[PDB]
Amino acid sequence: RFLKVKNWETDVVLTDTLHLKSTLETGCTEHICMGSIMLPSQHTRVATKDQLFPLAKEFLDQYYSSIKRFGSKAHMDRLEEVNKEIESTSTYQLKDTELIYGAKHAWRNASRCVGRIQWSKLQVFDARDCTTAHGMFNYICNHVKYATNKGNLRSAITIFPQRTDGKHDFRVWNSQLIRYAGYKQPDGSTLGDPANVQFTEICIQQGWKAPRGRFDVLPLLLQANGNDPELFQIPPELVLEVPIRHPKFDWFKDLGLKWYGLPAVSNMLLEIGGLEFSACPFSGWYMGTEIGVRDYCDNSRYNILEEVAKKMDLDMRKTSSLWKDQALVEINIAVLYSFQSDKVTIVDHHSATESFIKHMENEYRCRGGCPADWVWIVPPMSGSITPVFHQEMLNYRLTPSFEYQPDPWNTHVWK
Amino acid sequence: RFLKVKNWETDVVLTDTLHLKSTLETGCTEHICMGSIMLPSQHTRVATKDQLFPLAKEFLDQYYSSIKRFGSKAHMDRLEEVNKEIESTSTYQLKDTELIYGAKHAWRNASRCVGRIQWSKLQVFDARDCTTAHGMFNYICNHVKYATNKGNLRSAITIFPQRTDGKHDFRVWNSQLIRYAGYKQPDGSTLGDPANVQFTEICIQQGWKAPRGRFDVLPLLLQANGNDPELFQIPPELVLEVPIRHPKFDWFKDLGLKWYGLPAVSNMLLEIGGLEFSACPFSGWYMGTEIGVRDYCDNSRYNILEEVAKKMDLDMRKTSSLWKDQALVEINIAVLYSFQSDKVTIVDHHSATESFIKHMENEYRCRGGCPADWVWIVPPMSGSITPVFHQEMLNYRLTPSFEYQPDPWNTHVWK
Ligand code: HEM
Ligand code: HEM
Ligand SMILES: Cc1cc(N)nc(COc2cc(CCN3CC(F)C3)cc(F)c2F)c1
Ligand SMILES: Cc1cc(N)nc(COc2cc(CCN3CC(F)C3)cc(F)c2F)c1
Ligand SMILES: C[C@H](O)[C@H](O)[C@H]1CNc2nc(N)[nH]c(=O)c2N1
Numbered sequence: 091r092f093l094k095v096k097n098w099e100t101d102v103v104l105t106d107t108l109h110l111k112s113t114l115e116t117g118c119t120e121h122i123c124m125g126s127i128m129l130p131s132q133h134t135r136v137a138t139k140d141q142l143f144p145l146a147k148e149f150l151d152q153y154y155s156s157i158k159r160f161g162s163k164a165h166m167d168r169l170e171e172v173n174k175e176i177e178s179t180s181t182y183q184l185k186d187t188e189l190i191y192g193a194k195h196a197w198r199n200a201s202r203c204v205g206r207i208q209w210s211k212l213q214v215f216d217a218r219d220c221t222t223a224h225g226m227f228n229y230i231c232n233h234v235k236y237a238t239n240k241g242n243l244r245s246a247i248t249i250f251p252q253r254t255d256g257k258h259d260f261r262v263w264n265s266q267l268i269r270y271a272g273y274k275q276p277d278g279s280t281l282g283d284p285a286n287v288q289f290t291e292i293c294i295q296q297g298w299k300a301p302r303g304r305f306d307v308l309p310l311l312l313q314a315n316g317n318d319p320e321l322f323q324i325p326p327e328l329v330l331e332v333p334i335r336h337p338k339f340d341w342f343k344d345l346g347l348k349w350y351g352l353p354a355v356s357n358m359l360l361e362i363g364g365l366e367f368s369a370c371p372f373s374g375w376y377m378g379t380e381i382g383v384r385d386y387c388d389n390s391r392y393n394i395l396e397e398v399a400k401k402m403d404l405d406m407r408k409t410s411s412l413w414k415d416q417a418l419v420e421i422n423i424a425v426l427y428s429f430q431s432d433k434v435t436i437v438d439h440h441s442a443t444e445s446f447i448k449h450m451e452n453e454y455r456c457r458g459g460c461p462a463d464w465v466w467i468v469p470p471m472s473g474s475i476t477p478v479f480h481q482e483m484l485n486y487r488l489t490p491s492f493e494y495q496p497d498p499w500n501t502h503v504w505k
Numbered sequence: 506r507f508l509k510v511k512n513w514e515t516d517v518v519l520t521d522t523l524h525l526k527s528t529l530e531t532g533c534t535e536h537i538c539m540g541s542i543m544l545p546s547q548h549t550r551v552a553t554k555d556q557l558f559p560l561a562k563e564f565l566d567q568y569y570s571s572i573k574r575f576g577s578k579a580h581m582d583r584l585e586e587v588n589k590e591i592e593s594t595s596t597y598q599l600k601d602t603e604l605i606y607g608a609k610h611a612w613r614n615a616s617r618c619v620g621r622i623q624w625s626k627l628q629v630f631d632a633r634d635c636t637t638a639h640g641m642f643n644y645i646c647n648h649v650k651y652a653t654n655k656g657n658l659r660s661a662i663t664i665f666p667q668r669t670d671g672k673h674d675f676r677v678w679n680s681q682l683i684r685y686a687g688y689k690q691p692d693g694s695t696l697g698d699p700a701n702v703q704f705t706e707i708c709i710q711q712g713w714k715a716p717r718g719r720f721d722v723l724p725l726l727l728q729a730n731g732n733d734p735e736l737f738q739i740p741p742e743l744v745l746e747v748p749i750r751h752p753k754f755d756w757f758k759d760l761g762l763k764w765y766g767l768p769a770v771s772n773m774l775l776e777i778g779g780l781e782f783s784a785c786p787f788s789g790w791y792m793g794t795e796i797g798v799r800d801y802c803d804n805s806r807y808n809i810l811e812e813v814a815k816k817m818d819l820d821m822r823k824t825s826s827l828w829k830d831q832a833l834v835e836i837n838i839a840v841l842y843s844f845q846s847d848k849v850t851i852v853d854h855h856s857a858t859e860s861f862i863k864h865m866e867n868e869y870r871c872r873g874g875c876p877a878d879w880v881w882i883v884p885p886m887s888g889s890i891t892p893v894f895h896q897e898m899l900n901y902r903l904t905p906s907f908e909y910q911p912d913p914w915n916t917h918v919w920k
């Protein structure tokens with residue numbers, strides 16, 4: 091009822107009492123830990139009106155507790171107000187301030203997010219008056235423009251209307267607002283990003299004329315109020331990109347790599363007070379490793395370690411010459427150097443993981459804990475030379491929260 | 506009751522039914538995952554005679570099932586035989602073959618061990634006739650000599666007498682048979698291995714004349730049958746060491762680093778059929794990263810990244826120049842190259858993690874699963890360019906097993 095987490099690099103002990111407020115389940119049991127299942131059935135998302143008020147009551151109780159006015163009359167009135175509206179409409183609507191609070195705390199509670207030290211500096215765009223795919227496109231272009239801020243990236247989320255019935259449902263079909271296309275070739279190999287080959291062909295299935303190259307920014311596929319989704323090209327002037335060079339190796343430009351400045355996740359579900367927002371794209375800035383390690387070096391992604399090690403003149407016959415590791419570091423020095431040389435916000439895994447430890451200290455003191463997923467918080471390279479490797483972390487599921495959801499093209503009753 | 510684990514690099518699915526035979530608890534609950542607590546209270550170790558027979562019965566049932574003679578008469582006789590002996594003596598004794606089986610499967614079930622593909626090729630030394638610290642010393646020297654095999658390392662375990670009362674207890678006070686000493690300096694800094702500063706001073710408290718340098722192989726501290734422990738120097742000719750050079754950088758010899766060939770963990774508790782073996786040192790061979798990443802580069806260990814990056818002429822002002830990562834790779838290329846150039850068995854994290862995936866495929870097919878701790882199975886560098894990063898792993902606690910135990914100098918009623 092009062093759990094301790096240790097840092098074995100510093101011998102610092104934090105005491106977690108926030109996990110007692112926890113609600114949702116984790117997938118782990120007394121006899122099995124599933125802390126390395128990627129998409130647990132508990133992390134994926136259809137609710138009724140009965141269970142709605144406890145969820146609303148719980149959310150309002152913490153919201154008014156956080157504006158220093160818990161249990162007051164303005165609280166007890168809004169409790170009844172939402173109670174009455176849930177009786178009448180079997181749903182309800184958040185105030186603007188309740189929406190901003192819910193969004194920031196969904197991010198705050200995101201236990202797999204290392205970036206959370208900035209959770210309170212999130213810009214919330216209320217798109218709940220949107221009704222059409224063009225409206226969504228317009229709200230998303232504004233989001234992109236604002237969050238990019240000419241390389242001085244800012245955190246933002248845009249929140250489309252909440253689910254109601256289910257078949258009326260706003261969805262961004264893109265997994266990210268800005269992703270590169272993936273095309274299968276004649277021989278079977280892949281041009282561009284192999285992650286998106288399925289989505290890239292869906293866009294061609296709906297009309298996209300593909301420039302069939304590498305870093306072809308995909309179009310947005312926007313579903314409005316359950317209607318069939320529609321294709322929109324983000325104006326290129328809004329899609330900020332960094333060409334990737336190295337500060338030693340001049341052949342690194344010849345690699346011709348580039349990446350988009352803005353990580354902007356669009357397929358998630360935001361849950362606030364029992365309400366489900368099925369389209370809620372949010373963006374921040376990149377940690378170096380997400381591009382240079384995962385995007386560039388996953389076997390199932392661009393998979394460039396071959397060509398980088400070749401041009402580095404590396405012993406590639408022996409696995410134990412660590413040519414893979416050696417080329418991975420250079421690639422990440424290049425992503426960082428490239429982004430910083432262009433004044434595009436980027437953070438290295440050392441700075442970001444140190445900030446997360448600093449963030450954890452804040453959340454244990456002024457909040458009683460910080461839910462954190464070690465499997466995801468440790469960076470995908472050089473893990474133990476970063477402070478998060480040596481920090482025990484308690485993972486538990488708080489709300490408001492971002493949840494996964496099935497892809498719309500497996501559930502959308504088409505036409 | 507039939508859990509699926511996915512590999513997201515290969516889209517391979519394994520089906521785990523072995524977790525149903527699981528017994529011990531994990532520390533996780535439905536509402537909290539503790540899969541990143543280092544020493545869970547469930548992983549640490551005093552039992553009575555009542556609970557003893559179910560544990561024995563359970564162990565014998567799987568042992569005779571594995572020699573293709575389950576439920577036979579030779580089984581049902583040994584069931585009764587151990588039953589009777591537990592009535593009479595409130596304990597019992599394993600057959601040699603039952604001891605070899607229990608040991609191999611304790612290793613087999615070690616979910617944080619990436620090396621397990623070799624679990625059946627374990628040499629079991631029965632030291633259960635030992636009675637004195639000199640006897641232990643002699644059994645441990647033979648273990649070291651055999652397991653080292655002049656650099657052609659072989660897996661081995663030496664099993665001292667099982668706990669009985671508790672106050673009669675064989676313990677190796679060293680955490681590993683071969684560790685370097687740690688000495689605090691005048692200014693407070695540390696010479697040698699800072700991990701062992703506490704143990705190094707215990708040895709001086711009992712008489713060790715310290716050569717107060719860096720890589721000073723510690724003496725063994727051996728507790729026999731609950732008596733006060735005694736100091737013994739492993740004959741240096743038995744302690745095989747690798748001086749660490751690089752295959753490019755000739756200044757790397759000037760770093761003057763070296764490491765011992767034999768990883769030989771001595772502080773663990775082996776549980777077999779409810780019996781507790783409090784001294785059971787076991788050894789294999791090193792994965793590169795345990796030395797080059799954790800031993801050499803942990804801030805709380807030798808912490809050499811400073812000096813290596815200096816001599817590499819690295820941009821060390823900016824965190825984002827990744828000088829830490831760049832020096833870490835070279836250090837691990839040097840450990841591997843050094844060990845292989847001396848015909849001392851060593852495995853790189855790429856080969857070892859690929860073998861573990863191959864091992865998992867074997868354990869899911871011919872056993873129904875493989876308990877695995879992702880937090881510990883992923884190597885401490887370049888994690889996602891190794892196949893274990895992308896493999897979901899179910900952690901659960903089977904028996905026979907190795908468990909942690911408190912250090913003897915906090916529990917030993919001294920003199
Ligand atoms: C501001 C800079 C940010 C940084 C550096 C950052 C960093 C990261 C990283 C490295 C991950 C691991 C995911 C992966 O490796 O693919 C992650 C996950 C995540 N982040 Fe953050 N992020 C940032 C902003 C945000 C914002 C603004 C939100 C929400 C409003 C957010 C919510 C999440 C969520 C929901 C996850 C995934 C959890 C899951 O998979 O269940 N992040 N972040
Ligand atoms: C043969 C070569 C072996 C290799 C390459 C290997 C590799 C490893 C590695 C890298 C770890 C992580 C621990 C750490 O990072 O400090 C580990 C843990 C472990 N290994 Fe293996 N090991 C080997 C042999 C053995 C043997 C022979 C046994 C037992 C008879 C064993 C039992 C264990 C146990 C109990 C753990 C720790 C689990 C825990 O902390 O609860 N290993 N091994
Ligand atoms: C705003 C922001 C900034 C930043 N630097 N990085 C991120 C990554 O966030 C997420 C990343 C993923 C990746 C999911 N994986 C499973 C599939 F194989 C890819 C899911 C998710 F739900 C996220 F939220 C987000
Ligand atoms: C035989 C063998 C070969 C090989 N290559 N590596 C190992 C490492 O095994 C273990 C390593 C540790 C390290 C515990 N950490 C907690 C403390 F801070 C160090 C514990 C343990 F219980 C192990 F078993 C063993
Ligand atoms: C199998 C495993 O759960 C999966 O590969 C996880 C591991 N940890 C991760 N950590 C982060 N940040 N991102 C990821 O995609 C993953 N993938």
Ligand SMILES: C[C@H](O)[C@H](O)[C@H]1CNc2nc(N)[nH]c(=O)c2N1
Nearest residue numbers: 479480481482541542543880881
């Ligand atoms: C906090 C965390 O549990 C601790 O640092 C763990 C992480 N994973 C590890 N993995 C291995 N192989 N060895 C370790 O010592 C650790 N340490």
Ligand SMILES: [Zn+2]
Nearest residue numbers: 123533538539
């Ligand atoms: Zn867990």
